[PDB]
Amino acid sequence: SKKVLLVDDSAVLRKIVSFNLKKEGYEVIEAENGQIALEKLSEFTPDLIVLAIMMPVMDGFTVLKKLQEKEEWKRIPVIVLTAKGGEEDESLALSLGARKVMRKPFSPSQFIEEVKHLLN
Amino acid sequence: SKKVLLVDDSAVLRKIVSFNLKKEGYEVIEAENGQIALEKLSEFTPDLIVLAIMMPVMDGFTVLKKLQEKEEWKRIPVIVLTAKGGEEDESLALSLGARKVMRKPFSPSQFIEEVKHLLN
Amino acid sequence: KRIDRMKTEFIANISAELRTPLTAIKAYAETIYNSLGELDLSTLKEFLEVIIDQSNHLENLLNELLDFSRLERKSLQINREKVDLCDLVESAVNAIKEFASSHNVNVLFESNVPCPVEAYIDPTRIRQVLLNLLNNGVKYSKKDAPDKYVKVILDEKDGGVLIIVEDNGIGIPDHAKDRIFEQFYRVDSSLTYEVPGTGLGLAITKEIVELHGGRIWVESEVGKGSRFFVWIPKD
Amino acid sequence: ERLKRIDRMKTEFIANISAELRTPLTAIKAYAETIYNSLGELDLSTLKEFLEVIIDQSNHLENLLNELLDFSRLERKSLQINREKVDLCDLVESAVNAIKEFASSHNVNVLFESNVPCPVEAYIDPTRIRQVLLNLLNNGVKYSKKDAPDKYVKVILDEKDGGVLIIVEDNGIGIPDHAKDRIFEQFYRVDSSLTYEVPGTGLGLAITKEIVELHGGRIWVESEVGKGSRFFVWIPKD
Ligand SMILES: Nc1ncnc2c1ncn2[C@@H]1O[C@H](COP(=O)(O)OP(=O)(O)O)[C@@H](O)[C@H]1O
Ligand SMILES: Nc1ncnc2c1ncn2[C@@H]1O[C@H](COP(=O)(O)OP(=O)(O)O)[C@@H](O)[C@H]1O
């Protein structure tokens, strides 16, 4: 099955996003902050990364930047799922290599379309 | 067969309170504002009135005042269910003859306990 | 005075406006949780949709606060395109239909020119100006009248497009007309006490209009109604 | 000029309300929609769990709206204080329990010591002192170290200067010197790389200081960056 790395500091949010991904048959690996996410890339390569921005220890803008700095990691597609609503926040994330930026509060069924579109 | 007059300008709010009162076997008559509520006291005497404060046409403070000014109306117990949080708001409502003031957001099961207590 | 008194009023008003959808959220959620044996399937679903729709309204109110902070920071940018305003207005009209029905307000649209009315604007942002005007038309509508309406009128004037939002609501006193576009300003009267709001909508709308190179003004008479005029250059 | 006295802080304040409320709202909406669209794929156990999240996230959002309300009430001077004879010891334990889930979600241990035998009666408003203690305990969680195996917040009760002295101590991020003078001001939040993700409005400590002063007491702080902080709350016995 496709494998998703889900990166967010809210356990309540990881729970509901994971529920919806596993409804589609995906496997899900969770990380509580950006540094934990990059640690788990040493034990696998996901088909997709779902990334928040405002996390302790390492934020999602630093994650996106480090993803481009390593040959292995640079082509994993990333959807950014964030409360940062600015046009400027979205632009910065896309310029850092995010494939799509989705705002919070989000619709779980629109989120899942975008996940499927990127996986296929 | 206990009869409750439910007075609030929010259809959404009336719907949920009504659902909870009907789970107990009470009947419910609804009014969209204070004036309509006083008009419906022409056709029946409720065993209880659940009353909001901030309504157009006639507010709940004016309702409570007019309820004391008529012999037939003054003994019907009133629970005030309101978003007005202040201690001064509550004191005013109690001074105007309300039996109990409950804040919003509210617990439906706590609200039903207080309803039951006033009815018995 | 300046803003300080209005700031404290503003803070209390955020509390009040958000507390209403939150009350529905919490009561409906707790009811489902404690009444699972006592709900039929139509009712369960309806109660879930209330939660969802009330979350949506709360979300709109948060987006107002955000957009305002973004304007006080000149970060809010605009991206113009060629939009059929007839389509944009009809979409806005549809978006508010349910809110208007809950207050018994009829929502009308007339174009004084033939449609389409292509014009060079940011469609998201003008949709947002129209929704603030249409919402106020509902919020400040008469309290008990059988013929309450908000009408959008489209025309082409002075180079640009003129958009009028007309209502037969409560209207606005003379002294207040100058100030309604000010951040945090709200008319306080026995005809507005129950109506939720922050005083931010028209300050936001004025800033968006001005960013497009246009202006907005008002004509009102108390007890009759109000007309909000929005002039934006065509390009 | 002190135009931004409040003005730059006000804009910031507005943006911070939006952010802090957006978090619970995202959960409410995601969980409600998921239930709605998944009635067929939810077992009863999960249905109930997802409903409890909606209810708990609503409750957090309600707490944050009550902060905005209470701050406006203290500005208008309508907030009143009603004293009673309360066992502070028991009041602290109750606060500590109220914050256990939130502390646990950040791996923060919450402790209580009394330097005096107990009960420790004092003539104070129970609701209002609860709210002081919750704001200090919340801040000890929120501003706790990012990655440490021994994070704590500790409430210490003593009887000093013909009053009660409540200390809330943590081993969190600490507060720099320039910031120390200003943390009790309405809207003030330390902005650093160690606080960027932490939600808040800058009203908690302004509220707490006002409640404390209505009781005829005072609140002050001691801190060192990288070590932690101690908040001191002195309230007269009667
Ligand atoms: N169509 C209208 N009729 C009457 N009064 C209006 C209308 N639209 C706006 N107002 C007045 O202008 C004030 C500012 O409106 P706005 O900035 O949208 O804020 P809010 O709607 O939150 O109070 C309102 O409080 C109200 O007094
Ligand atoms: N225990 C603490 N450790 C470190 N910083 C603190 C602590 N408590 C408060 N602060 C700082 O004081 C500021 C003001 O706190 P408060 O008024 O509670 O508002 P908020 O918590 O919403 O920012 C916080 O933003 C933070 O910088």
Residue numbers in the entry:
A (entry chain C), B (entry chain D): 2 to 121
C (entry chain B): 245 to 479
D (entry chain A): 242 to 479
Wording from the paper:
In order to confirm that the sulfate ion was indeed stabilized in that position thanks to the presence of the phosphorylatable His in a gauche− rotamer, we generated mutants of HK853 and RR468 defective in its phosphorylatable residues H260A and D53A, respectively, and obtained the structures of its complex (HK853H260A–RR468D53A) at pH 5.3 and 7.5. The overall structures of the complexes were similar to the HK–RRpHs but the absence of the imidazole group due to mutation of His to Ala was concomitant with absence of sulfate ion bound, supporting that the presence of the His was required to coordinate the sulfate. A second sulfate ion bound to the catalytic site of RR468 was also observed, despite absence of phosphorylatable Asp due to its mutation to Ala. The presence of sulfate ions at the active center of RRs lacking the phosphorylatable Asp has been previously reported for MaeR triggering its phosphorylated conformation.
